[PDB]
Amino acid sequence: QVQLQESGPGLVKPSETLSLTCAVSGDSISSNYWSWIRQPPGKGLEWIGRFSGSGGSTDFNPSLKSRVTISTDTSKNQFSLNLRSVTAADTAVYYCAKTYSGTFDYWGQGVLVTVSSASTKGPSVFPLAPSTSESTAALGCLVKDYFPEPVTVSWNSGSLTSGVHTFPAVLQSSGLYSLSSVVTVPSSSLGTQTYVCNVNHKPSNTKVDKRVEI
Amino acid sequence: VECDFSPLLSGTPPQVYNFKRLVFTNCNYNLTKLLSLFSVNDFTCSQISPAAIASNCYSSLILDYFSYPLSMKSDLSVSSAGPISQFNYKQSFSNPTCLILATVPHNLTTITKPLKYSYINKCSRFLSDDRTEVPQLVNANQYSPCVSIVPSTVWEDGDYYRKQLSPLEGGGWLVASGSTVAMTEQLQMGFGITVQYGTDTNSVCPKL
Amino acid sequence: DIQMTQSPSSLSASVGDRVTITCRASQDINNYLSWYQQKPGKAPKPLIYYASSLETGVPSRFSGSRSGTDYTLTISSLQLEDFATYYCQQYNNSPYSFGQGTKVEIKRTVAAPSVFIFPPSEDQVKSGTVSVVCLLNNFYPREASVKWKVDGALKTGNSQESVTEQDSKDNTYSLSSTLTLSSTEYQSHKVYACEVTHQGLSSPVTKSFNRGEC
Structure with a gap:
């Protein structure tokens, strides 16, 4: 007890x-x-x-x-x-x-x-888009320069969970963290279906919805 | 072919309640070579008939060693009701046994002195009601039942160590109390000797 | 002090296997050894105390043993609950040393990584610092090599790797090699290649993109 x-x-x-x-x-x-x-x-x-x-x-x-x-x-x-x-x-x-x-x-x-x-600092979110596509495609979002840990990442507001890989952070020599979240989706859905990555960094209160565009 | 007493002459020896034991089979020994490396103070033995201890063959030779002060030298006899003979170290009453008390010489530097002497003054098991106390007396040539819950050295005099047992083992608790006796200037240790016998092998003879 | 050498550092096994984890002490510890199980992100869980005595409420699959100065933790029948990192500790004398730990991970069948390279977004090009990300998705085992061939030859030092933990459905890993460069240096070279070598690949697979070519 x-x-x-x-x-x-x-x-x-x-x-x-x-x-x-x-x-x-x-x-x-x-x-x-x-x-x-x-x-x-x-x-x-x-x-x-x-x-x-x-x-x-x-x-x-x-x-x-x-x-x-x-x-x-x-x-x-x-x-x-x-x-x-x-x-x-x-x-x-x-x-x-x-x-x-x-x-x-x-x-x-x-x-x-x-x-x-270092004091608290917000991230800079970037899309990671492919130009060759064969059967299965993959795209992601880069989350560079944010302090401190941690940060949450979602895709399509949680409606996309299968195949999503969110990597651990890398404490750069700049005293700031940096990571990337990737997702593999069918190549046949790229044209007719959107994909957004939702970022939230509470220590900096940063809330970003970035679109991944080909 | 020669019995190796090297684990005794290296490192720090343990305490009386968690003594280190060395069993010797298929080798020859030289007890005078060992006792010459320690200033031998007091010692006793019981039983012969073959008869010797350094001039006879046996099936095995058991040697327990532990750090022990000569201040409590009287507590090692079987006729004593002290916590050492009751909860720490009891030797065989049937087989021929010996018991040697010596001091680590100043020219023997490989053995480093422990911080202090330690022993168990009481080891008992409490039942599921936490009121019925069962003294866990140590048997001959066995360890205390409370060794699993007592540190390798008692940290302070008057300390209490307890751990709740598993329901499979019977539940309840196991409680032990520790006592400390301040260290000497030269490390004083105690050696416990017992010899067994068998019909097959007798390859534990003295070196000639 | 007394220091511990626990081996193997990591092993791959599946459910039902028998796994033995050994632990050697620099000096005699006199059976004052303890075993722990650590799940990811949680405190160590005591399993065995005094070399061989089982803790309360611990399954009978776990047992402790001693031979010479080697202390072994053997799981008779491995199960899904047991895949974690295990440690051995000595409390014979201060200071109390800890084992390096043995990571028990579920073993998959070998699978080659799906390699994707991501060119830096044009929004980041004006920021002064670019970040080329190369992805190795769903592979096993974890060991793989990634090299950076910029405009033909190898450039070193500016790499950053990040490996995820084992997947839940397929038990694979995923890794990213991020190349951080100055923006002016990125416009200097034309082709940027990511060459990976994995034992599931017969020859190194390379994914490249021509800078500026849409």
């Missing part, structure tokens, strides 16, 4: 310091042990450090021990994580978890922390 909930900003400026609070529901932190674990997007797990609300002294990972500190709260039934001098490599999904001997019985829904020097 013991639950966990992470609470973080999601975006931390490069030079400054990030604070992450973990809320434990259904159990007391003044018993057992707890710890933090981070996971960079697309790689393995890195154990931050274990502590105790019962004792309670700590034990951290030497790779981050010089930049990691921890606070404990009994009444609010929570505990926080303080990581200073964060770098671009500190972008990871941070988990708080329970333990009794080093393993982890219960995890919380991980929270994402991205570090990059």
Whole structure:
């Protein structure tokens, strides 16, 4: 019945310091042990450090021990994580978890922390149209230069789902993301049927309906 | 052809409740070669008849080793009601067994000292009502039932570790309490020796 | 510290197969090993603790074992629910190291990619930065090579790849290679070719378009 909930900003400026609070529901932190674990997007797990609300002294990972500190709260039934001098490599999904001997019985829904020097910016949507057509044709929409993640893409207001491939974003050297969404449709329907791509970037409140024209 | 005692002379040794065990079959040993690498303090043995321990052939030679302070040296006898003989380490009462206490010398640097000594002061299983307590006494030449839920080292004195069991295993909980004894200047360890016998092979003889 | 070498990094299997995942420690961990299952976008799910003890509510298909210093996670009968990334963790001594993970992916039969190249829209030509997108749609396995032949010869460095995850209906992948260039450089060369090499193709397939030619 013991639950966990992470609470973080999601975006931390490069030079400054990030604070992450973990809320434990259904159990007391003044018993057992707890710890933090981070996971960079697309790689393995890195154990931050274990502590105790019962004792309670700590034990951290030497790779981050010089930049990691921890606070404990009994009444609010929570505990926080303080990581200073964060770098671009500190972008990871941070988990708080329970333990009794080093393993982890219960995890919380991980929270994402991205570090990059940029404010919110809207995308520039472009159609990707073919000039040769054989039986099956494919077209798409490019979503270049937008910050931050994420962005939702639809085709014909959701009435087109089969064959649609929406790619992950590529964090360019410009500190901005860029992706493309493609769809394969019959070549016999190109002349008599339209195709629009619906983009929505809530951090910038950008809402675009772009037509793919041959 | 020679029994390899190298896993003992490398790394950090475990604690008493999660001791490391080495079984020796089809090899020859040299016990004087081993005991010369440790300052031997106290030791005891029980039972002979073949008779020896360094001058006889057996079917197997079992050697358990773990870090153990000489402060609690009395808690290793079978006649003791201490938590070590009750929940941590009990050796065979029937077969001929030995028990050696030694210290890691200053010239033996390959073995790194643990942070502190640790042991289980109580290991019990609670039933589905969370009120009926069943002390899980350790059997001879077996591990504690609470080893699955206790860290490789007790983190703080007076800590409690518990985990809810699966309904297939019977439900309830398994709770264990840990105690810490501060480290010495030289690593003190304890060795447990037991010898078995069989009709087929006796290829565990001393090296001559 | 103690560090873990988990292998294989990824394997292709189907429902009903038996799959074994191994995990080796740099030093003896004394059976203090744990296994986890991680679904995409979710927290790790504990499966096995203390090398071989099964967690509560975990199917009997999963088992833990130890031979020498190798720790193996074996799924007796693989099923659709189990296709995820699996990790092994040691808690014998701090710091707690994690396995790199083993990705269990459903295996399809080999299929060559449908290759499409998209010329940049004329709206982007005036923007100063162009983006030629080449699409490799519905192929298996994931490994493929993409080269950029501009006006004849190979240009390198300005590429950006993005691979999607396995499809739900056909269990295929899809990838895009995006070439970002300056607008002035794009008007300099005539033909732009996208050459792909996949084990489902007898010879490299090339898709090209002449710049400006409608």
